[PDB]
């Protein structure tokens, strides 16, 4: 298991901006080319892994139409925080958010799970 710290639950007031913290303490240094971060979302608990944020030496946003342009990245991974920021949270944004880490040279593949809840 990798040292990934994510809040399993986070509650946010509808219409507001929310930050989704994904932080790792993987011992090996971050090489931009080796390092991979992929961000997905689940409408229902066991729905499809709706990827929305790739990483290829830079922030690659799938730019989802359920997430038109309120999604931007909220960290500096070479300081080991990879959180993601959502502007103007809305109730379909309710669901599962997941951060998956890869830290070459390190072999192990990490996983973060955050369930975002939306207030009213």
């Amino acid at each position: 298991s990798m040292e990934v710290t994510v809040p399993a639950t986070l509650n946010v007031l509808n219409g507001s901006d929310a930050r989704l913290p994904c932080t790792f303490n993987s011992c090996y240094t971050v090489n931009h080319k080796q390092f991979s971060l992929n961000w997905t979302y689940q409408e229902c608990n066991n729905c499809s892994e709706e990827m929305f944020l790739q990483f290829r030496m830079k922030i690659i946003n799938l730019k989802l139409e359920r997430f038109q342009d309120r999604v931007e990245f909220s960290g500096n991974p070479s300081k080991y925080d990879v959180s993601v920021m959502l502007r103007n949270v809305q109730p379909e944004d309710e669901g599962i958010y997941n951060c998956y880490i890869m830290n070459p040279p390190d072999r192990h593949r990490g996983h973060g799970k955050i369930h975002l809840q939306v207030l009213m």
């Binding site: 011992c27 090996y28 090489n31 040279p105 390190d106 072999r107």
Partner: protein, 1261 residues
């Protein structure tokens, strides 16, 4: 009287309280005997059966008035408590307190606690514990907590003088309990570290261990001054090394041809991976670092197409450097402790130039040796004094009757027991006959012999067991050894085979006929008690340290493996398991901490490893390992063989006489005046002098013949004719000396024999050459013996002579120990062969030296099949293996000198069977063999040698009359005077000048504060020089310059102030003159260096000139008395060290000449490279200096060992050289290296120690 025991009833509490009140209204040491813990004196005799284990009244009068209650166990152990109720809850009458005392003192309590501790330890050694282990942890904590509660009951809670918290061990237990409680409710590595510690204090209490612990504690307390001296010296040396080698280890080889528009800067900004760097810099195959290079001509060279540049990281992860002061101090500590000092030496020289061997030389001798042995000295003296004080204060049936009788009658210790030992010798000779490529027939032959021999010995055992009653049998302390072994053997017969080599140890019974060996054996025996207690404390220490390391660095070692290993697999030395941790702590105690620490730091991080390793190292090596020698040194400070000999005198004489009887029944004034003439001459100092010069010149001629002689042709010719002249000279000397002295006198002197022989070899060689009888095998061999010409110099100088005598005077005594040591090593070697013979072969890929996966080449058949389909495969065997009892001894030597041991240990712990491919750690636990062997070999044996030699020296001295055996006649007068210095009385006070002003200046310079100030300023100047680093900005450089200018101005100021008042009296004090010299030197330095930087062009000389500033820093020794005393001791030891140094140089010179002749042109592999070879005189002597400290000797040896293909090629061209082939001679190589390391040990190591010990004492006295 005897029955003074009486029960403390409230009434005696009230009578104690009334007395205290009386004392108060009115307003002494106690019986060391009746002290708590101590046994009841027999004066009181037995206790009434109801008074034992009960609150009784205080015996000792001192306390009879104060409030207390004593309790005694069924072992008469006195326990004193506090009568005051703890927190006034329950009293010394409350049944609960009685129950407490009872259960606390029962033997059960303490047995349970220590049991608990031991099983807790077994659970800590668990890298991965199961789930029931939480339950057992609960159990443990509960037991300990309960014990703590019981302790707090009897003694109370911080109530009076005698309470739970008052004892610090109890405080520790309480602290441990609190931490455990705290962790569970709501750090963890630290908490468990605190847990293990309990063992240290709870097990040191057992009998025997306590004395060793006290000697250990006293050693640490007495090592204070020595440690301060070490720090100071190391600091000064680091400041010197930083100046000379700042930035030098960043020199690399950079491509001259580059892809277009790629400057070094851009290149560096992009390169991150190892392969990226290999593409731009030059790296040797199988190297994680780049090749160091230099800008001079004695420095390392760079390939063509690559140029040298100072850029990048330093070697070994960035940890070997002299860039800052901290790093320099680490390097200097490494050079003092001689840990991979060879690597540092080599790298440093490749980047700075071979001409810095002087800097390394100085440090190793005057620094490292003197400090290490001074540490030994203090520890030794501590142990000795402790031991001294300790001694001071201490001061059916009839059938049995028939059988037994008969059997005893037929055995005769006189003969039966002797032939048995002769046979033991026979059988160990047979155990030495086992090798690797042995035939099946040979195996069977030796096997039958093993049967025969154990049958012989077992019949004997049973015979004796029957004869002498089995009771008295077992009583004997040799019979039980015998029985054990015979039983083992028969079991095995009906991993044990290796324990029959111990039967050999029975031969030490017959030592009781050779007086000296007998005495040595006894000394040893006396010693073994404390030897064992010390072993115990060492094991405890290692255990605890290993556990701590596993707890703190183990997880890190697992998670960050890729950083320290390219394959991302745990390195052979790690700390993720208990066993591997034990091993690393053991390696530190043997003295190899820098490699493992590099790795630790690279994963754990630098601060934690530094402290761990440092603490670990300090206690184990510097203290405990020195107690080994201290104990042995203090130790140094019936015979039926003869019965049988008498029987033999009876027999051989009687029988021969009877046979003789049977045979008888059957049947020149002039010439004398001439001897006196040539006597005058051969004694005149002029003759002597001339001859010394000739011997010196002859030796330089030997050195001139290198592999480059043929470039230098004039010199070659000169030298041939010169050798002819020299031979004439020496023959003429010989003849004169035969007419002066006389054949008799001549051939009785041994120096003369030596000279005769050298002249003779040279004459033979000359005859041959001039006769055309040259170009033959003996003639060439004789040409190599020219290297002994250097010896004549030995006889002329007195110092070399004194040292050589002392050594000759010990040879008698070194031999005995050698016999004892040889037997021990033989045992171990036979064992080794049995376990590891033939199992060191692998199938490597020669392109890159990599044992094939072993899933793809299981045995040998398959290696060979792969060699059919592909090339670059070989069934390679280790060069120094355990394949016969001869190579075994060499392997062992390497293991015991700790140079080359790892290569062997690895292959051992990887062994599968005879023709099968080694597998990674298949036999991981083979390290135990080496642990035990390592231990004995390096700790007992070598220390035994040292002890014996030093004892011999002290005896040699005693017989002369206390006269130093390492000093010459003139050197002795100087010694006497220098000693007078340390005992000089204070001189007359300097008269105060009477010009008001000078009177004032005088008052100032004479005040103690004036000097304290000067000392603090010197201390600040040292800090100014320590903040200098590689890469400091011009701003920093400028600032530091002006600070130093101000320091110079101030010191010049105090000097002229002194000169005003003291006037001429200023130069009547030695320290004041040193200060003057330093002042001038400093100014000169500043000015000159400023010029070289501007007008001239010499960066090298800038540095060397600026080494002057450290003179101001050396003025510190005056202020510190502890430091200056040791320095004075070193000053007295200097003349003796000089002679030893001269002898070492002679021997080293001879060895270098021999190497140039034989080891040149060998394959450049392992230790032999382009800059450390035996091709020239210079290169040769560098290597030999290294090996004087037994460092890297194994590496040099490996190239020499291989004499056959494909390892070496006989026909190598060697263009520009007549010699053909790169093959080396194995027989010559082993002798050349082994002899040197032994000589070194007996000269430099053993002599240095003796001198230090002798003078340390003198100075302190």
């Amino acid at each position: 009287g005897p029955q003074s025991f009486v029960h403390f009833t409230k009434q005696s509490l009230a009578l104690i309280e009334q007395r205290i009140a009386e004392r108060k209204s009115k307003e002494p040491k106690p019986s060391s005997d009746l002290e708590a813990g101590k046994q009841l004196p027999f004066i009181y005799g037995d206790i009434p059966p109801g008074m034992v284990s009960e609150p009784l009244e205080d015996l000792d009068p001192y306390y009879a008035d104060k409030k207390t209650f004593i309790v005694l166990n069924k072992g008469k152990t006195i326990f004193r408590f506090n009568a005051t109720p703890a927190l006034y809850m329950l009293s010394p009458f409350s049944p609960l307190r009685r129950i407490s005392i009872k259960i606390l003192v029962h033997s059960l309590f303490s047995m349970l606690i220590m049991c608990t501790i031991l099983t807790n330890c077994i659970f800590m050694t668990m890298n991965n514990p199961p789930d029931w282990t939480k339950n057992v942890k609960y159990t443990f904590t509960g037991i300990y907590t309960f014990e703590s509660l019981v302790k707090i009951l009897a003694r109370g809670f911080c109530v009076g003088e005698f309470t739970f918290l008052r004892d610090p061990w109890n405080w520790l237990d309480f602290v441990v309990i609190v931490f455990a409680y705290l962790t569970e409710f709501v750090n963890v590595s630290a908490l468990r570290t605190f847990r293990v510690l309990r063992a240290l204090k709870t097990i040191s209490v057992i009998p025997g261990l306590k004395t060793i612990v006290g000697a250990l504690i006293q050693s640490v307390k007495k090592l204070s001054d020595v440690m301060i001296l070490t720090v100071f010296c190391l600091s000064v040396f680091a400041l010197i090394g930083l100046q000379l080698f700042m930035g030098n280890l960043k020199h690399k080889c950079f491509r001259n041809s580059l892809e277009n528009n790629e400057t070094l800067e851009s290149i560096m900004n992009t390169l991150e991976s190892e392969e990226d760097f290999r593409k731009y810099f030059y790296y040797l195959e199988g190297s994680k670092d780049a090749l160091l290079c230099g800008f001079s001509t004695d420095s390392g060279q760079c390939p063509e197409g690559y140029t040298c540049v100072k850029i990048g990281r330093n070697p070994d992860y960035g940890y070997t450097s002299f860039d800052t002061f901290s790093w320099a101090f680490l390097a200097l500590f490494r050079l003092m402790t001689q840990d991979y000092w060879e690597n540092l030496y080599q790298q440093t020289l490749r980047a700075a130039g071979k001409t810095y061997m002087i800097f390394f030389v100085v440090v190793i001798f005057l620094g490292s040796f003197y400090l290490i042995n001074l540490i030994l000295a203090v520890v030794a003296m501590a142990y000795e004094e402790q031991n001294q004080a300790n001694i001071e204060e201490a001061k059916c049936s009839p059938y049995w009757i028939k059988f037994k009788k008969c059997i005893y009658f037929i055995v005769m210790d006189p003969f039966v027991d002797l032939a048995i030992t002769i046979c033991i010798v026979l059988n160990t000779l047979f155990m030495a006959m086992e090798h690797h490529p042995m035939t099946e027939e040979f195996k069977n032959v030796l096997a039958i012999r093993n049967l025969v021999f154990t049958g012989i010995f077992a019949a004997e055992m049973v015979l004796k067991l029957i004869a002498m009653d089995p009771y008295e049998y077992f009583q004997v302390g040799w019979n039980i050894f015998d029985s054990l072994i015979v039983t083992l053997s028969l079991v095995e017969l009906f991993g044990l085979s290796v324990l029959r080599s111990f039967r050999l140890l029975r031969v030490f019974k017959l030592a009781k006929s050779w007086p000296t060996l007998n005495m040595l054996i006894k000394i040893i025996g006396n010693s073994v008690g404390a030897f064992g207690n010390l072993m115990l404390v060492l094991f405890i220490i290692v255990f605890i340290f290993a556990v701590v390391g596993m707890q703190l660095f183990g997880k890190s070692y697992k998670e960050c493996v890729c950083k320290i290993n390219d394959d991302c697999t745990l390195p052979r030395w790690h700390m993720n398991d208990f066993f591997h941790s034990f091993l690393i702590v053991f390696r530190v105690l043997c003295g190899e901490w820098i490699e493992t620490m590099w790795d630790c730091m690279e994963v754990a991080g630098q601060a934690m490893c530094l402290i761990f390793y440092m603490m670990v190292f300090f206690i184990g090596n510097l203290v405990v390992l020195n107690l080994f020698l201290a104990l042995l040194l203090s130790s140094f400070s019936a015979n039926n063989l003869q019965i049988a000999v008498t029987r033999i005198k009876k027999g051989i004489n009687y029988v021969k006489q009877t046979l003789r009887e049977f045979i008888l029944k059957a049947f020149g004034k002039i010439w004398w005046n001439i001897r006196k003439t040539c006597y005058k001459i051969v004694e005149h100092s002029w003759f002597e002098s001339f001859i010394v010069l000739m011997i010196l010149l002859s030796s330089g001629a030997l050195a001139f013949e290198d592999i480059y002689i043929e470039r230098k042709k004039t010199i070659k010719i000169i030298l041939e004719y010169a050798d002819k002249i020299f031979t004439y000279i020496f023959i003429l000397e010989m003849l004169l000396k035969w007419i002066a002295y006389g054949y008799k006198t001549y051939f009785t002197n041994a120096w003369c024999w030596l000279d005769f022989l050298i002249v003779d070899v040279s004459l033979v060689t000359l005859v041959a050459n001039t006769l055309g009888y040259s170009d033959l095998g003996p003639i060439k061999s004789l040409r190599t013996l020219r290297a002994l010409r250097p010896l004549r110099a030995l006889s002329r100088f007195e110092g070399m002579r004194v040292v050589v005598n002392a050594l000759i005077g010990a040879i008698p005594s070194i031999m005995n120990v050698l016999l004892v040591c040889l037997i021990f090593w033989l045992i171990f070697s036979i064992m080794g062969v049995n376990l590891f013979a033939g199992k060191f072969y692998e199938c490597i890929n020669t392109t890159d030296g990599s044992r094939f996966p072993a899933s793809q080449v299981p045995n040998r058949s398959e290696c060979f099949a792969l060699m059919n389909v592909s090339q670059n495969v070989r069934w390679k065997n280790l060069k120094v293996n355990f394949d016969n009892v001869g190579l075994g001894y060499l392997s062992l030597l390497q293991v015991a000198t700790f140079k080359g041991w790892t290569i062997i240990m690895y292959a051992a712990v990887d062994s599968v069977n005879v023709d099968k491919q080694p597998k990674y750690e298949y036999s991981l636990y083979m390290y135990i063999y080496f642990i035990f062997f390592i231990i004995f070999g390096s700790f007992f044996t070598l220390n035994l040698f040292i002890c014996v030699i030093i004892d011999n020296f002290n005896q040699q001295k005693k017989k002369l009359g206390g006269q130093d055996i390492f000093m010459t006649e003139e050197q002795k007068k100087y010694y006497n005077a220098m000693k007078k210095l340390g005992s000089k009385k204070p001189q007359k006070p300097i008269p105060r000048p009477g010009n008001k002003i000078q009177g004032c200046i005088f008052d100032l310079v004479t005040n103690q504060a004036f000097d304290i100030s000067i000392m603090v300023l010197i201390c600040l100047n040292m800090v100014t020089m320590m903040v200098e680093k590689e890469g400091q900005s011009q701003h920093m450089t400028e600032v530091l310059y002006w600070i130093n200018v101000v320091f110079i101005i101030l010191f010049t100021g105090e000097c002229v102030l002194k000169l005003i008042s003291l006037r001429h009296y200023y130069f009547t004090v030695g320290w004041n003159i040193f200060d003057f010299v330093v002042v001038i030197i400093s100014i000169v330095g500043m000015f000159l260096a400023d010029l070289i930087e501007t007008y001239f062009v010499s960066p090298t000389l800038f540095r060397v000139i600026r080494l002057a500033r450290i003179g101001r820093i050396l003025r510190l020794v005056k202020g510190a008395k502890g430091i200056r005393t040791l320095l004075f001791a070193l000053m007295m030891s200097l003349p003796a060290l000089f002679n030893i140094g001269l002898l070492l140089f002679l021997v080293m010179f001879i060895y270098a000449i021999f190497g140039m002749s034989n080891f040149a042109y060998v394959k450049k592999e392992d230790g032999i490279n382009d800059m450390f070879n035996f091709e020239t005189f210079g290169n040769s002597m560098i290597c030999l200096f290294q090996i004087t400290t037994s460092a890297g000797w194994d590496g040099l040896l490996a190239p020499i060992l291989n004499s056959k293909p494909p390892d070496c090629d006989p026909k190598k061209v060697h263009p520009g050289s007549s010699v053909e082939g790169d093959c080396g001679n194995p027989s010559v190589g082993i002798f050349y290296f082994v002899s040197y390391i032994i000589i070194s040990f007996l000269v430099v190591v053993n002599m240095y120690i003796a001198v230090i010990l002798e003078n340390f004492s003198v100075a302190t006295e």
